[PDB]
Design an enzyme around this catalytic site. Sequence first.
Site, PDB file in Angstrom:
ATOM      1  N   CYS B 161       0.590  -1.270  -0.075  1.00 29.16           N
ATOM      2  CA  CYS B 161       0.184   0.039   0.099  1.00 29.16           C
ATOM      3  C   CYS B 161       0.850   1.280   0.150  1.00 29.16           C
ATOM      4  O   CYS B 161       0.451   2.433  -0.240  1.00 29.16           O
ATOM      5  CB  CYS B 161      -1.062  -0.181   1.134  1.00 29.16           C
ATOM      6  SG  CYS B 161      -2.031  -1.579   0.805  1.00 29.16           S
ATOM      7  N   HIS B 296      -2.536   7.406   6.484  1.00 28.48           N
ATOM      8  CA  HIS B 296      -2.682   5.955   6.007  1.00 28.48           C
ATOM      9  C   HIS B 296      -3.927   5.445   6.286  1.00 28.48           C
ATOM     10  O   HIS B 296      -4.599   4.706   5.479  1.00 28.48           O
ATOM     11  CB  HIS B 296      -1.536   5.296   6.412  1.00 28.48           C
ATOM     12  CG  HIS B 296      -1.825   3.542   6.285  1.00 28.48           C
ATOM     13  ND1 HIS B 296      -1.552   3.057   5.252  1.00 28.48           N
ATOM     14  CD2 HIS B 296      -1.973   2.460   7.258  1.00 28.48           C
ATOM     15  CE1 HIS B 296      -1.860   1.959   5.399  1.00 28.48           C
ATOM     16  NE2 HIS B 296      -1.975   1.432   6.511  1.00 28.48           N
ATOM     17  N   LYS B 328      -9.629   7.430   3.071  1.00 34.26           N
ATOM     18  CA  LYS B 328     -10.281   6.041   2.752  1.00 34.26           C
ATOM     19  C   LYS B 328     -11.596   5.772   3.078  1.00 34.26           C
ATOM     20  O   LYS B 328     -12.185   4.784   2.686  1.00 34.26           O
ATOM     21  CB  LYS B 328      -9.153   4.987   3.206  1.00 34.26           C
ATOM     22  CG  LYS B 328      -7.651   4.910   2.520  1.00 34.26           C
ATOM     23  CD  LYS B 328      -6.884   3.833   2.968  1.00 34.26           C
ATOM     24  CE  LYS B 328      -5.619   3.705   2.441  1.00 34.26           C
ATOM     25  NZ  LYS B 328      -4.581   4.930   2.799  1.00 34.26           N
ATOM     26  N   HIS B 333      -9.421   1.271  -0.303  1.00 30.16           N
ATOM     27  CA  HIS B 333      -8.118   1.147  -0.389  1.00 30.16           C
ATOM     28  C   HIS B 333      -7.727   0.568  -1.555  1.00 30.16           C
ATOM     29  O   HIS B 333      -7.984  -0.509  -1.808  1.00 30.16           O
ATOM     30  CB  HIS B 333      -7.855   0.032   0.779  1.00 30.16           C
ATOM     31  CG  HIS B 333      -6.511   0.062   1.180  1.00 30.16           C
ATOM     32  ND1 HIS B 333      -5.620   0.676   0.548  1.00 30.16           N
ATOM     33  CD2 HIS B 333      -5.878  -0.583   2.296  1.00 30.16           C
ATOM     34  CE1 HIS B 333      -4.390   0.679   0.859  1.00 30.16           C
ATOM     35  NE2 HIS B 333      -4.440  -0.346   2.127  1.00 30.16           N
ATOM     36  N   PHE B 391       1.493   3.452   4.140  1.00 29.11           N
ATOM     37  CA  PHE B 391       2.324   2.513   4.741  1.00 29.11           C
ATOM     38  C   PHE B 391       1.815   0.819   4.214  1.00 29.11           C
ATOM     39  O   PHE B 391       0.885   1.143   3.555  1.00 29.11           O
ATOM     40  CB  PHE B 391       2.025   2.313   6.592  1.00 29.11           C
ATOM     41  CG  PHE B 391       2.346   3.706   7.041  1.00 29.11           C
ATOM     42  CD1 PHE B 391       3.294   4.298   6.711  1.00 29.11           C
ATOM     43  CD2 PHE B 391       1.729   4.113   7.947  1.00 29.11           C
ATOM     44  CE1 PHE B 391       3.438   5.745   7.152  1.00 29.11           C
ATOM     45  CE2 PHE B 391       1.660   5.235   8.722  1.00 29.11           C
ATOM     46  CZ  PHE B 391       2.702   6.060   8.366  1.00 29.11           C
ATOM     47  N   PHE B 393       2.241  -3.590   3.950  1.00 29.45           N
ATOM     48  CA  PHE B 393       2.606  -4.796   4.596  1.00 29.45           C
ATOM     49  C   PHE B 393       4.194  -5.169   4.464  1.00 29.45           C
ATOM     50  O   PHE B 393       4.641  -4.582   3.534  1.00 29.45           O
ATOM     51  CB  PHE B 393       1.837  -5.956   3.938  1.00 29.45           C
ATOM     52  CG  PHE B 393       0.171  -5.972   4.379  1.00 29.45           C
ATOM     53  CD1 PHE B 393      -0.378  -5.331   5.274  1.00 29.45           C
ATOM     54  CD2 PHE B 393      -0.201  -7.262   3.804  1.00 29.45           C
ATOM     55  CE1 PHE B 393      -1.648  -5.613   5.614  1.00 29.45           C
ATOM     56  CE2 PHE B 393      -1.522  -7.397   4.279  1.00 29.45           C
ATOM     57  CZ  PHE B 393      -2.203  -6.617   5.078  1.00 29.45           C
TER      58      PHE B 393
HETATM   59 NA    NA Z   1      -2.387   9.277   2.976  1.00 28.72          NA
END
Ligand code: NA
Lengths: 407, 407
Positions: B161, B296, B328, B333, B391, B393
């Site tokens: 991401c 995020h 989001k 996402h 951010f 995985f």
């Molecule tokens: Na952002």
Amino acid sequence: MRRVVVTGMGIVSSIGSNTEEVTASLREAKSGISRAEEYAELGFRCQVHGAPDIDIESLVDRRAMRFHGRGTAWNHIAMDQAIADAGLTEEEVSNERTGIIMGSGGPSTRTIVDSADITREKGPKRVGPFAVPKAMSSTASATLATFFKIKGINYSISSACATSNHCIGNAYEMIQYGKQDRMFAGGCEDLDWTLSVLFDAMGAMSSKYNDTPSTASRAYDKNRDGFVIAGGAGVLVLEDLETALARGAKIYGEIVGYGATSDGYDMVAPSGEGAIRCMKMALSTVTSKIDYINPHATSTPAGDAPEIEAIRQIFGAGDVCPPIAATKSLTGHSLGATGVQEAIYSLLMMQNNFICESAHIEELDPAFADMPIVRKRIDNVQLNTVLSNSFGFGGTNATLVFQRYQG
Amino acid sequence: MRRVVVTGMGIVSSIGSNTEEVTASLREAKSGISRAEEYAELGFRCQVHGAPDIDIESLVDRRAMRFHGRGTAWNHIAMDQAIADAGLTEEEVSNERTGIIMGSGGPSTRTIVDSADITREKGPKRVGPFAVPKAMSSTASATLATFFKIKGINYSISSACATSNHCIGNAYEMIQYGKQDRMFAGGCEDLDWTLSVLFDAMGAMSSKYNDTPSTASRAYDKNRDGFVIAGGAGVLVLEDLETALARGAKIYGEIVGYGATSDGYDMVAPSGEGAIRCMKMALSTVTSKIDYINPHATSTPAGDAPEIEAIRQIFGAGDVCPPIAATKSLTGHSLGATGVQEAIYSLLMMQNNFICESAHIEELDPAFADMPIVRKRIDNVQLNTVLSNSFGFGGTNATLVFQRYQG
Ligand code: NA
Ligand SMILES: Cc1cccc2c(N)ccnc12
Ligand SMILES: Cc1cccc2c(N)ccnc12
Ligand SMILES: [Cl-]
Ligand SMILES: [Cl-]
Ligand code: NA
Ligand code: NA
Ligand code: NA
């Protein structure tokens, strides 16, 4: 800009499971290519591959394997080898000044297919909870950064067969610019029918040597008929020169040039002119002569020739051109792993004062008769500067130049 | 180091098919999330998604589509939009000083699965000859570099991401260091059950709001229960400041900071401390206050909170902390596309003097009651500096800071 050196290497290849095995294969021109019975069963035209022969479970423990596909498991092995070779402490692996740029040409295609199959046969829950980090394009960086507790840079570059050359080059830039002091750089690729079939379907892979698999990859041979696919991994430890010197590092070589360009032409076929610009870019920061070229040459009708023309344009023909030896004739083509593995082959040749044969040339293509393609291993030669090209689908070009460190 | 500005934008999102549509959705807090009937049919727990609504065939011609999966087709659309927005000539798109760093979190999983299925049902030849450039991790860079005749840098970064934040940051570095004068930077992701199931299987996606899909993504809500997956694309045109000024470019903002770090901790859960180091890195080159944070925050129990703590550590709590609004909650996402899309949302908010609501907060999580999470759209506000985190995985962190250009 700071100077940058290679202080450790690790490798899993079709021609050996560590640097010693790989060196022996290079010296003896021992092919890593074998019959792929599974490809024949599935009806492929090409029925050869370059498979590593390594016991993963003996080298990576079960919990450590939770998020690894096979390609990244090979990459973990190569990272352990490179850490051991460099003699790094835990603190030297895990700190804010130390990063990782580690890529693959694709993710675990096997994981993706198995997941889709099990979804439809047994339900989505039966995919299990550990599939994403295997299936994502960043799998090589994510898995290793997490396991080795990397705290600096962490991402993957991908660029098809250029992948790990760009990974090394970008990691070189990070250190040159002062952003990081140590980098783990390289890449990997699984070997699986779910990836290989994509290439068979395009007619890209060798199919006329299935009954003599060991000679199917034959860069520069008049009767070459496509590449041979392989899997594996490689890792370089890169350090700024002061860091390396102060800790008494081994220095396998200094990175002295990096080129990266784009053809902007054809998806599969190289233009040639992009390669010329890429090599000139790599050479623009190099003052010494080049003593050996490790070409991209993949054993394809349409690929080996434009690169030779580009080399001719830069270096000339005959004796004034550096010796050229295509290691893919022994190793096949490991896609994401190719670049770093070829860097390692070249550094091992420099370490051991020889240039390997460009193998399996039964009849040289007359288009290349003017060029110093190595027909027999050259011994007792002092190599001081070596150049390696990797080019990828989508017209992506990367070149690296390494030099023996003498101050 | 040279200054670097954004001179053009393009976007395909669950909240609009161009920047005008996206701006309207942001202003009105119009959700892009709908029911995913196919997910229900396949037995998923999560039955919601953020699907673009755009007619690809009307915008990308058939021959131009040969090597595109759906994600990269959306990326091609975004690239056409960004070229048109920037007002670039053909010569300005295609030259040695102009490159592309364009990524996706994965390749076309659909292509990979379809290929495996057809191999087993009808034979390998029936995969067809155009599958590799769709299935490889570099698909977004390869397809666009080839079609738009890019001659400079050409590769993909992937970092889950974080992908397109790192793509933009690395492209920023290329220009800062003088290696390129113009870059196309961003990324994309297809939306397909063959990718989404991997996340459903890990229990990562929202499943308690299937009967009210539009409110399923709800960052900072006490009853958030996972992220909602989306597809799309975005592109920024980046230029060195002199290049931009001399051609009378639009300047949407100046890139003034970039952070990239690694948690070295857990594969799925963030550590928090990595995010703090990433934000400090981005802010180390910024002199002005931050007027808006695009977090995020993905609407997960375990993810939204460590980022809030990291923001608290850097900025403080309450009124002294910049306003925070999680886009989001409207968009879902989009994995590889997230970073660049959030850069675009933030630049469009700066252009239009408003900060969107952080949507679908029915009951604020009490852990966040001290923080300036935007509960209602803020109008008539002059934003001059904006910060966006992504951010991924594998503990991969990227932060970008953009500033209104005033000299
Ligand atoms: Na952002
Ligand atoms: C431009 C060029 C051509 C041939 C060889 C070169 C070399 N060895 C170093 C630098 N530049 C070179
Ligand atoms: C370190 C730090 C904390 C809070 C805000 C900052 C800002 N606006 C610019 C630079 N550094 C900052
Ligand atoms: Cl083409
Ligand atoms: Cl973990
Ligand atoms: Na089955
Ligand atoms: Na090479
Ligand atoms: Na079928």
